[PDB]
Amino acid sequence: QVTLYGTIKAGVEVSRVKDAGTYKAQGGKSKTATQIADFGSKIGFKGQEDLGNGMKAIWQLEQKASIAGTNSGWGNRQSFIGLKGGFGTVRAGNLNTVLKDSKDNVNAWESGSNTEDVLGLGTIGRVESREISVRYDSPVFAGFSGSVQYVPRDNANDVDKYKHTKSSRESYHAGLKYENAGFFGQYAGSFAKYADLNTDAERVAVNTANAHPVKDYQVHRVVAGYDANDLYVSVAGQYEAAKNNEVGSIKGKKHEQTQVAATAAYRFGNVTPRVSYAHGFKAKVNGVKDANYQYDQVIVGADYDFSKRTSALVSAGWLKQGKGAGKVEQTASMVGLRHKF
Amino acid sequence: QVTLYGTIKAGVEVSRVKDAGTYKAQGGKSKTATQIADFGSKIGFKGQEDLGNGMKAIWQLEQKASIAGTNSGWGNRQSFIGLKGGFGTVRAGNLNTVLKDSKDNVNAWESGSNTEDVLGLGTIGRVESREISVRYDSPVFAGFSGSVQYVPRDNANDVDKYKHTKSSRESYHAGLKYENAGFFGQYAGSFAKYADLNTDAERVAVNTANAHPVKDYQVHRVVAGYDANDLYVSVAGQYEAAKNNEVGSIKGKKHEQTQVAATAAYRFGNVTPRVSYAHGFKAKVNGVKDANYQYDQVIVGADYDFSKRTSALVSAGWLKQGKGAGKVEQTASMVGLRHKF
Amino acid sequence: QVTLYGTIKAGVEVSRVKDAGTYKAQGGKSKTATQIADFGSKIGFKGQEDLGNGMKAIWQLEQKASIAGTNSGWGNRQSFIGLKGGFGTVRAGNLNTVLKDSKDNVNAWESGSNTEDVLGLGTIGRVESREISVRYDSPVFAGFSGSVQYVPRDNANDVDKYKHTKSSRESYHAGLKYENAGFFGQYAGSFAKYADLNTDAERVAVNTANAHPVKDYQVHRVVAGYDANDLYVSVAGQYEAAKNNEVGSIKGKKHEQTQVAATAAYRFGNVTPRVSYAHGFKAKVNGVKDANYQYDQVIVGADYDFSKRTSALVSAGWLKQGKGAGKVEQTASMVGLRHKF
């Protein structure tokens, strides 16, 4: 039969930006923003049937479901149909990319969408997405699991099914994980010979306004540390690079940026203090060191677990972006509540 | 664990408007409108977990779900997360305003959206809404319960989190209820030092087209009668007032209107005849008696209860709005069916 | 109490169009389109309560729920409230038209929306729809069942409830079915004295851009064969006609087209090979034989049933539309998977 599940999560977030360019007030100070915000409440349906020969059918329909009433849609979170057996798992649908699944071991902070960059490691998680795709996941081979994912060209670009006037945006995603004696280490990455980027280095759909076409787009993520014995610690290294593919005098010219992230948390019975640091390095844009993309952020917080499904959350965030006169410093704090059903 | 619930309700409504200004036909008569209409079918999910120390976690996700297929969205009806214990209730989310909860004791008629003004006391219920908010509800103190609700400034106006260029639309909502020997009496009200209104005296979001900015916006509702022993009777008094806050020669100038409503119903086993009268008084707009907002409406109807969850509904509505040559008279009737699950 | 149900279905579809007018490449050949596509996954809620006197209350809320995340809305598939007893069934809501219910015995192919015309008998199913309506279904009288359905004028045209400036789009739908010794034969049809059509002969809402107003719009469907003993066979005949109702020199001038469809399938235990042919005849448009609407399509495929709720699907489609130089040939194939819960 079928299972219903979800997570409800919300809280109040206080936030303050200090931007020289956009803010009248002396110092460049914006005012306090005091807001009730949903942290991405979701609700889902999933089922499975045994087909007899050690093989199951699997499906999921998960949805964003903010308790502030700002969401609509079915299947807009990870949703699929698939088969599972001795050979492993195959799914097709609106699937978490391999790099998005690796978020658990990198970014565990709960946040409003307005504070996902300051109160969470949102910047390093700008390469996570959901894509319509087929995906394979291997069984666990003595602590080793792996996965491979592919986005078809015509799933990447519907307009051009029958007229390949635009280059293919087909993308490959792939991952290898190792867990043993609690210890964890994994590689996550993606490649697209052709892709498109926004100014925030997030990938955007082909034909989005102000999108910059790129070639040989590739992301590399590596995480390790581990998760057991009343303690968590992880570190992650992320590398991303592409080449300019906008005709003009910059075409073929090389983009890249390197990010690192560090998180540690220790559990005192029902209280789990946590700390996270992240660094966005110097960015090379069009083969030119560009300091606008460099950043330093630190998050501190803790979770009180009333039960194994209900937590209280608190956290504070410091974020500095760029260098020089065009600097943006974000500070925010939160108190919140979460329920998993 | 988790509960699923809802209400399905629909029927056919006949309606006829008699407006001098908008209608060609002699008398000013519009034609019969004969329509199948949803009366606001809804579907919801709610759960709760005991946290041990006489304290529960609570959540809800409720949605409009018209069986005519005109709704989309999650959490667009009362949805929240909260905590309940000996101290009472605290919720945060898309919450019924305190004045919206008081609708049960004032307006109990089921209706299409097109007939909510004639086949229900819709006019007096123009001050009911749902707002993103924190809300406290007191335990029942020997028949006395109370509640307090607040909308943050930055929840009232997202655009201006960091630039308080516009005045705060933060609002307070508050209520006191007393139930005893069946007898009921309650006060419901709200205050916003700054708010915005449409031409129909409904509150609208900041920056809505043709919205009139107001100051010291305050609503006052009072209801009493009671509900037991095969009989219901209630009466309600509503007062609303603000000051013009549109720069120009009218600013600071005073708005107000007073409404009264009366309902009685007696139950003959499985049939519950009901009657309702409402009066919208002379309106003072910009300190000037304005008769356009005055109205008189009467509703008569009954409910046959096939079961405690399935009812048949019938009702007829007479509505007269304004005075003079610019008069609008609405007549409508309905037959319907409702199922609570 | 209440039931949850649905169907999850998706697969990969390959498709190729060969159009002289729209395609550069020599032959007129478009390129392969290789796509992951949802075949119309849906999810629904339904319940019923006994009212005692051999009579039940019934409701449904069904929704499109593509696992590619492209759907939003509640009640956008067949949703209703109703009563059922010895006398039969009455429903009111977003109801399947009588002709849409007859699709099971005519078109059983699962498909993406982009391939519903080639990998399914989509063309003959251009007269199926869901309309806000009241509907009666008769009990089975010795193999005979019948149904009647009506769309109110003001449900057909909301804008004009009170100003009948536009002619009524009220429509009647009606059907008679006979099942016995497995044998099945049924009549399905609809009539609207006034209606509107798109260029693809699909009915569109009043005031849709490029809609052609028609009068005496009527559809006639007839199906027979039968469904038992390890074998299925059906044949269907469809007739549709109207008169031009666009003022201009063509008004009153007569439209019509005749379609026929043929399907046979035999079950080899868990494998059900199937074949379907369909023919769209010469069309008379404005009383003028027009060959653009003529077509010939054939589908071959089979279903492997892992269980009684999980199937694997395969099919291939050939479609030729029109005659002459303005000819469109579509070829497509699919492999897919379906789960009914």
Residue numbers in the entry:
A (entry chain X), B (entry chain X), C (entry chain X): 1 to 341
What text does the study give?
PorB is a trimeric anion-selective porin and the second most abundant protein in the outer membrane of N. meningitidis, possessing a binding site for antibiotics in its pore. Isolates of Neisseriae with intermediate resistance to antibiotics have been reported to exhibit single-point mutations in PorB. These mutations are located in the eyelet of the pore, the narrowest region within the channels, which contains a large number of charged amino acids acting as an electrostatic filter. In this work, we show that a single point mutation in the porin PorB from Neisseria meningitidis, the causative agent of bacterial meningitis, can strongly affect the binding and permeation of beta-lactam antibiotics.
Crystals of G103K PorB from N. meningitidis W135 were grown under Jeffamine M-600 based conditions as previously reported. The G103K single point mutation, located at the periplasmic side of loop L3, causes no significant changes in the secondary structure. The electron density around K103 was solved clearly from the α- to the δ‑carbon atom, whereas the density of its positively charged ε-amino group could not be determined due to the potentially high mobility of the side chain. In accordance with previous computational studies, wt PorB shows two distinct pathways for the transfer of anions and cations. In the G103K variant, the bulkier and positively charged lysine sidechain extends into the pore, thereby occupying the pathway for cations and leading to its disruption. Our experimental and computational electrophysiological data demonstrate that the conductance of G103K PorB is lower than that of the wt protein. Ampicillin transport is substantially reduced for the mutant compared to wt PorB in these experiments, demonstrating the effect of the single mutation on overall antibiotic uptake.
